[PDB]
């Protein structure tokens with residue numbers, strides 16, 4: 001119902017880390033870790049911002065081809081090829097910029113995350129436009145496309161949802177939490193995650209890392225997406241179901257992200273059901289279009305020659321079936337326990353630590 | 360909705376304590392800590408069991424006086440005095456037995472907890488009988504009284520609730536969790552709680568202790584009370600609301616225990632409202648009849664000459680008002696945070712550690 005358990009965890013982290021949290025150079029800088037930890041003005045991030053602004057051209061090209069389809073000369077497969085090559089360049093060019101230019105913990109990662117979101121939205125816009133035009137005013141269309149692009153959803157036509165209320169003027173009650181919460185992660189990386197500045201100990205290494213993920217889940221999904229929905233007055237405000245109450249790893253993927261789940265359902269599962277392709281390949285396709293966006297986020301900025309996250313995400317397809325069998329045999333409690341163990345030992349948070357140890 | 364966060368905490372405790380949990384003398388004894396940790400047959404617990412069986416006489420005396428009130432010779436205030444002295448002896452005699460006889464972590468504590476429950480039930484039976492008789496078959500009355508005494512509620516007349524279904528035959532799916540869960544606490548006391556086998560560190564001492572309480576809240580309220588209700592086919596099965604989602608310490612007392620909350624509401628708040636006594640004294644009375652039952656549980660078996668838990672519980676009356684003002688000023692999130700901090704530093708779990716450090 002509320003975040004009481006999260007408040008308990010935050011209070012526990014504050015209490016156990018009493019020597020450093022309470023005693024720190026707070027006379028001039030109230031930040032827990034450093035005055036400028038995640039990034040600073042010294043970094044040459046201006047090309048990254050310039051390319052982020054320039055990334056808006058691909059939506060403009062999608063708009064112009066979608067407007068140009070009304071002409072009789074242009075046909076369907078040429079438009080499909082144009083959409084495919086526009087989407088391919090939209091993912092290729094940021095990768096080239098990130099490889100050639102420098103990167104950081106947040107400076108280079110944000111370029112890749114926006115690229116995946118725009119790619120998913122660009123595919124979503126094209127597929128929805130094709131579906132709408134299949135059945136037998138520039139300003140309104142451009143406004144709708146811009147609202148879809150800025151809104152916190154991966155599905156076109158967000159008009160049906162409507163907030164129907166004035167946005168909260170006192171948003172600083174929420175936003176002020178975020179800058180505080182991102183401080184705590186800045187502490188947690190400093191103390192717990194520091195390998196080099198009996199049979200195995202990776203589980204002992206997985207205890208703090210999963211706490212970084214959930215906090216990273218709280219900063220983005222709970223706070224930032226709700227702020228985006230409220231500022232834009234978007235109707236729906238349910239970006240994730242109770243993913244922690246997942247009987248298996250298969251159910252976690254449906255609950256942890258509702259925009260991504262809905263995109264996968266409407267674009268990868270729905271046409272496969274319409275095309276008579278059983279949901280045995282759709283799972284691989286869904287996980288293929290998730291790993292490519294969970295590997296470009298983490299491998300592209302830093303070095304990449306081993307322990308690729310693509311294989312880690314692709315390994316989930318055995319794991320969802322294995323956990324489904326295990327929970328169906330041993331009950332919901334055992335299913336939740338083995339799901340948490342799998343998420344700790346071979347889950348998403350472990351991929352970040354595998355790359356941190358590499359660099 | 361489920362215990363996914365609790366499963367996450369259990370998996371985290373297993374992962375961080377990988378050296379001892381995985382590697383242990385499990386060839387002959389599968390218990391985590393010791394073959395006989397909490398108690399053993401060597402302890403002379405037979406007098407304690409004999410007195411626990413003998414404790415059932417006070418309900419029989421309550422029954423016999425309640426049956427004898429129908430006679431014209433006996434009056435009301437003599438019956439009230441008989442109920443008062445019977446309740447007083449019912450709490451005095453177990454205290455005398457525990458002081459004279461030996462005690463342990465669980466051997467002596469269980470004698471005191473049953474005494475408080477029977478005292479609350481005996482007062483509840485007498486007050487309800489007086490209310491029923493105020494307005495103008497031995498076997499059925501005895502059966503109803505026995506069902507009330509064994510049932511997991513502190514209020515008389517549990518007949519209106521009804522399970523109306525057959526109890527779960529495969530109860531071992533639940534009971535087998537409990538003996539496992541009590542094992543984990545047996546580990547947690549061993550490693551974390553071991554003081555003697557900068558400005559302050561009590562917060563660092565409060566981090567594990569609150570985890571012992573919540574697990575102790577899971578073993579008793581979630582599992583044992585539900586098992587008692589299902590075996591006896593008792594209707595209501597809501598022994599606690601979302602106490603973790605408490606904006607203040609005042610709301611925690613209402614949510615953490617529904618039988619005790621209902622007893623306090625029906626016996627201490629309701630007649631005070633009927634008697635025109637404002638709810639400013641009822642809170643002190645409610646906490647006076649809670650501290651006496653949170654001090655006899657912990658001080659009576661072990662030594663008691665300082666740091667009495669009665670003063671600790673009585674100190675809550677300032678704290679509920681202070682936390683109400685603080686949360687009303689600073690919002691629900693700040694209220695939950697300061698509630699968790701107060702519960703860590705001066706809450707119920709700290710009282711147990713204060714006595715553990717003493718002995």
Ligand SMILES: CCCCCCCC/C=C\CCCCCCCC(=O)OCC(COC(=O)CCCCCCC/C=C\CCCCCCCC)OC(=O)CCCCCCC/C=C\CCCCCCCC
Nearest residue numbers: 052106110113114117118149150151152153219220224259
């Ligand atoms: C040039 C400056 C731009 C800078 C950003 C300004 C944003 C406003 C944006 C765009 C205008 C550009 C116009 C161009 C195209 C417009 C199309 C577009 O992308 O806009 C819509 C989009 C915007 O919001 C974002 O998510 C964008 C990403 C921003 C956040 C990254 C920020 C810094 C790094 C880490 C943050 C630390 C983490 C705490 C968050 C605290 C901070 C928040 O939202 C959605 O619709 C998506 C629907 C939601 C589902 C998407 C799949 C979710 C999957 C996975 C992650 C799972 C783990 C969570 C955390 C992941 C990160 C570790």
Ligand SMILES: CCCCCCCC/C=C\CCCCCCCC(=O)OCC(COC(=O)CCCCCCC/C=C\CCCCCCCC)OC(=O)CCCCCCC/C=C\CCCCCCCC
Nearest residue numbers: 411465469472473476477508509510511512578579583618
């Ligand atoms: C001779 C052998 C008897 C031995 C026990 C057999 C029980 C069956 C009983 C009785 C027949 C006797 C006939 C004589 C009179 C009958 C009247 C009577 O008392 O029966 C009803 C009663 C029974 O259940 C109990 O609670 C009794 C206590 C038993 C548990 C203690 C056990 C060992 C120590 C610790 C356990 C470790 C903790 C994990 C639990 C794992 C184990 C479970 O239940 C209720 O109705 C109460 C309504 C619920 C509200 C009461 C207020 C709650 C407040 C606070 C505690 C808050 C913290 C929780 C944990 C507290 C402990 C740390």
Ligand SMILES: CCCCCCCC/C=C/CCCCCCCC(=O)O
Nearest residue numbers: 104105116289290293294297298352
């Ligand atoms: C130096 C920078 C190091 C960065 C390492 C940590 C990066 C954290 C990444 C977060 C998880 C990535 C999730 C991406 C989801 C994309 C959308 C999709 O799922 O399809």
Ligand SMILES: CCCCCCCC/C=C/CCCCCCCC(=O)O
Nearest residue numbers: 463464475648649652653656657711
């Ligand atoms: C050696 C034994 C040491 C025991 C120390 C720990 C005891 C734990 C006690 C649990 C909390 C007590 C709660 C009692 C509630 C009684 C009913 C009421 O609230 O009115």
